[PDB]
From a paper:
Building from an extensive peptide-based screen for potential JMJD5 substrates, our results provide evidence that JMJD5 is a JmjC-hydroxylase, catalysing the stereoselective C-3 hydroxylation of arginyl residues in sequences from proteins involved in chromatin stability (RCCD1) and translation (RPS6). Consistent with previous reports, JMJD5 residues 174–416 fold into mixed helical and β-strand topology comprising seven α-helices, 13 β-strands and 3 310 helices. Like most 2OG-oxygenases, the JMJD5 active site contains a metal centre, which is octahedrally coordinated by an HXD..H motif (H321 and D323/βII, H400/βVII), the 2OG oxalyl group and a water molecule, which is likely replaced by a dioxygen during catalysis.
We were unable to obtain a JMJD5 structure complexed with the hydroxylated product, but did obtain a JMJD5.Mn.succinate (decarboxylation product) complex structure; this structure manifests substantial conformational changes relative to the 2OG/NOG complexes (with/without substrate) including in DSBH residues, such as the Fe(II) binding residue D323. In the succinate complex, part of the β3–β4 loop (aa 241–248) is disordered, whereas in the apo-JMJD5 structure the β3–β4 loop, together with βIV–βV loop, encloses the active site entirely. The combined structural analyses identify mobile regions involved in substrate binding/product release during JMJD5 catalysis, i.e., the β3–β4 loop, N-terminal to DSBH (aa 234–254), and the DSBH βIV–βV loop (aa 342–381).
Author numbering: 182 to 240, 247 to 416
The structure:
Amino acid sequence: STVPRLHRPSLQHFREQFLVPGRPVILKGVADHWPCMQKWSLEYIQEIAGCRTVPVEVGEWSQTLMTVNEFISKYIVNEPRDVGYLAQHQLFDQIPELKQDISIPDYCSLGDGEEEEITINAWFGPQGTISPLHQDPQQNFLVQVMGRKYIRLYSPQESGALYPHDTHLLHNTSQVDVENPDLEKFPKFAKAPFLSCILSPGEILFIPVKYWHYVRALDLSFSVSFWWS
Ligand SMILES: [Mn+2]
């Protein structure tokens, strides 16, 4: 089934129908006019951030460091040799000027945590980046700025069909490749129900705490996530 889209729902409707029961939703009309939505071209990113060092996940997975200018040159603009992803990086703490182009969603105030503790991560990469199926320990608003992403969501109630890795370090990550699952080794995966969507610019996906999610970029993409409680 498809994740529902709601236009600027009230705080109470979001709380009662999505936050408390832990149900995903896409919020429309919330982030669509944030400055980032019109301002964040590649050229703007290069002007404001190009000389700064960022962590880049390549691939055989490795983590390296390079400037934003290098990342753009090697993994976005020139016919790249491998997939590189500027993933899960607190770019807005590093570059406070960019924080002026985003806002904390008002719905985060329904949480029990402090705004000071909300973690804001950038996710910037070419078409074809993949975040394998995993779950996070806080609520998440994933705001799509540039490009589209295909997202698959499985409830925590389906965890037994997703074959989490046994190591404590990877217990929040599935052993299954969502889009080409090995059903001989992971047969229960096939019948596990899920939601999916294509998340487009200006839209926010609410990923409830511990909801399993898998993400593939369909175009050159930039997302901003807000981890909150
Ligand atoms: Mn995640």
